[PDB]
Design a protein around this ligand. Structure first.
Ligand SMILES: N[C@@H](Cc1c[nH]c[nH+]1)C(=O)O
Ligand SMILES: N[C@@H](Cc1c[nH]c[nH+]1)C(=O)O
Ligand code: NI
Length: 465
């Protein structure tokens, strides 16, 4: 009727907002701040804020906002939500170095111990979305947010059912119900769309784009965005030496991957960050060189008779990753590396066992809110939430720590580029492509978001005509 069916990759376990960005994506939860369609930070739940000095953030919340259970969004509710998320999630904790929070009425004051200029930016992170900590339901199954669609039922790792919250603060939402089901295989997501089992899908495989564009019942939307595919190394395994990481870096053919695997919907990568960001100084592009890789591997004693063995993990959710793994395996054999590819259904859970993998295909949104700090703190610091391979170098740590208290924006750019230059020498990961996000829908579905941060999808204006 006005019911919308969505098919997404990357199944979740908990759907607490501090465990996954899914509740923000599907319209259930909202953070204090957001980014707009051009990627700039804006107030969302906040009416006004001020920073009287470099350790104090004063916020006044909007006065007309309710949670989906009818409770008012007050400063006390925001305090308890943020404190709970800090306690329950390392990602949230390491992004928000908050020393205290005080609340009265609609006003809250957030303090830090020292200057952290990216604090407001990180309050736009979907993992910091606000939920009602006093709700008498399990936040891991049916959290209660302020968004336009309330989660009514969750079948773990399979299906989320949401219903219109009529008193949504920005206006009455335009759909009656949304059903989200997980499907990891992109070809299956496309088949579900073509058969009308689903109405909106994300992460469309590039080789299906033409088939969908050809269909007059469907439409495809693409956004270049800020997501990077990569080969991530497990630094806790002593065999993954600098020579080995450099060898693998030279077996990748980034230009060929962008042209033939992504069919032009990606550009070859050097650093984590898309080269379209104008202040980023990218390292030199590595061109494939099998002879160089063989020479590097000989440094550690590997030969055709005694090759390096690598267990490489992959997953289906981002559909080009496993196509890249196959061609890495074929080419690596020419350089005396035998790669065994293991495709897994739950990538984040699988990689927690650091004895079970040598390298993994991976993807990540490296600059979702306009600053490089988030990525460096989460991917290049020990215990950072996306640093699955435990990369850490004290010299890089020092620069990241300096960046965190640096207010002057041009100085932040300079330190960021120094971190890129120093870290690149270690080959912490091999960044492969800056690739577009491709979303497809039935033509009757209108006003979903396909914007550069790669997080938002559903809002109170999304509809079916
Ligand atoms: N960060 C990886 C793996 C992941 C699973 N769920 C969320 N992320 C990706 O987005 O492709
Ligand atoms: N799937 C999102 C969010 C995430 C957090 N951790 C892993 N993934 C991304 O890769 O950017
Ligand atoms: Ni992810």
């Amino acid at each position: 009727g006005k019911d919308l069916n969505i098919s997404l990759p990357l199944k979740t376990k908990s759907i607490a907002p501090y465990e996954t960005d899914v509740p923000v994506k599907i319209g259930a939860a909202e953070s204090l701040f957001k980014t707009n369609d051009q990627g700039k930070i804006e107030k969302a739940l906040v009416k006004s804020y001020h920073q009287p000095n470099d350790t104090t953030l004063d916020i006044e919340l909007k006065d007309n906002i309710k949670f989906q259970n009818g409770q008012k969004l007050t400063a006390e509710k925001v305090k308890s939500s943020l404190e709970n998320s800090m306690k329950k999630s390392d990602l949230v904790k390491y992004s928000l170095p908050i020393s205290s929070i005080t609340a009265k009425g609609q006003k809250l004051t957030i303090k830090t111990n020292s200057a952290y200029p990216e604090l407001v930016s990180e309050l736009a992170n979907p993992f910091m979305a606000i939920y009602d900590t006093d709700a008498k339901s399990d936040v891991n199954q049916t959290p209660v947010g302020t968004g336009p669609y309330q989660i009514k039922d969750y079948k773990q790792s399979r299906k989320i059912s949401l219903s219109n919250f009529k008193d949504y603060w920005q206006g009455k939402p335009k759909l009656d119900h949304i059903t989200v089901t997980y499907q990891e295989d992109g070809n299956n997501r496309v088949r579900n769309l073509e058969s009308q089992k689903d109405d909106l899908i994300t992460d469309v495989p590039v080789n299906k784009v033409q088939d969908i564009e050809n269909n007059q019942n469907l439409k495809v939307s693409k956004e270049s965005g800020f997501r990077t595919s990569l080969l991530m190394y497990n630094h806790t395994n002593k065999k993954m030496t600098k020579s080995v990481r450099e060898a693998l870096d030279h077996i990748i053919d980034r230009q060929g991957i962008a042209d033939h695997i992504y069919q032009g919907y990606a550009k070859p990568a050097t650093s984590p960050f898309n080269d379209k960001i104008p202040y980023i100084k990218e390292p030199k592009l590595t061109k494939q060189n099998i002879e160089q890789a063989k020479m590097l591997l000989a440094k550690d004693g590997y030969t055709k008779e005694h090759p390096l063995k690598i267990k490489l993990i992959t997953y289906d959710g981002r559909p080009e990753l496993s196509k890249i793994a196959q061609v890495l395996q074929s080419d690596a054999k020419k350089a005396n590396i035998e790669i065994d590819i293991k495709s897994v259904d739950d990538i984040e859970g699988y990689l927690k066992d650091r004895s079970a993998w040598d390298a993994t295909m991976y993807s990540f949104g490296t600059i979702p809110r306009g600053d490089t700090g988030y990525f460096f703190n989460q991917a290049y610091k020990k215990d950072g939430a996306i640093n699955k391979g435990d990369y850490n170098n004290s010299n890089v740590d020092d620069l990241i720590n300096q960046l965190n208290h640096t207010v002057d924006v041009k100085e932040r750019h300079n330190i960021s580029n120094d971190i890129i230059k120093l870290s690149s020498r270690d080959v912490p990961n091999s960044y492969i492509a800056y690739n577009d996000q491709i979303v497809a829908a039935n033509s009757k579905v209108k006003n979903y978001k396909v914007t550069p941060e790669g997080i938002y999808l559903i809002d109170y204006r999304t509809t079916i005509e």
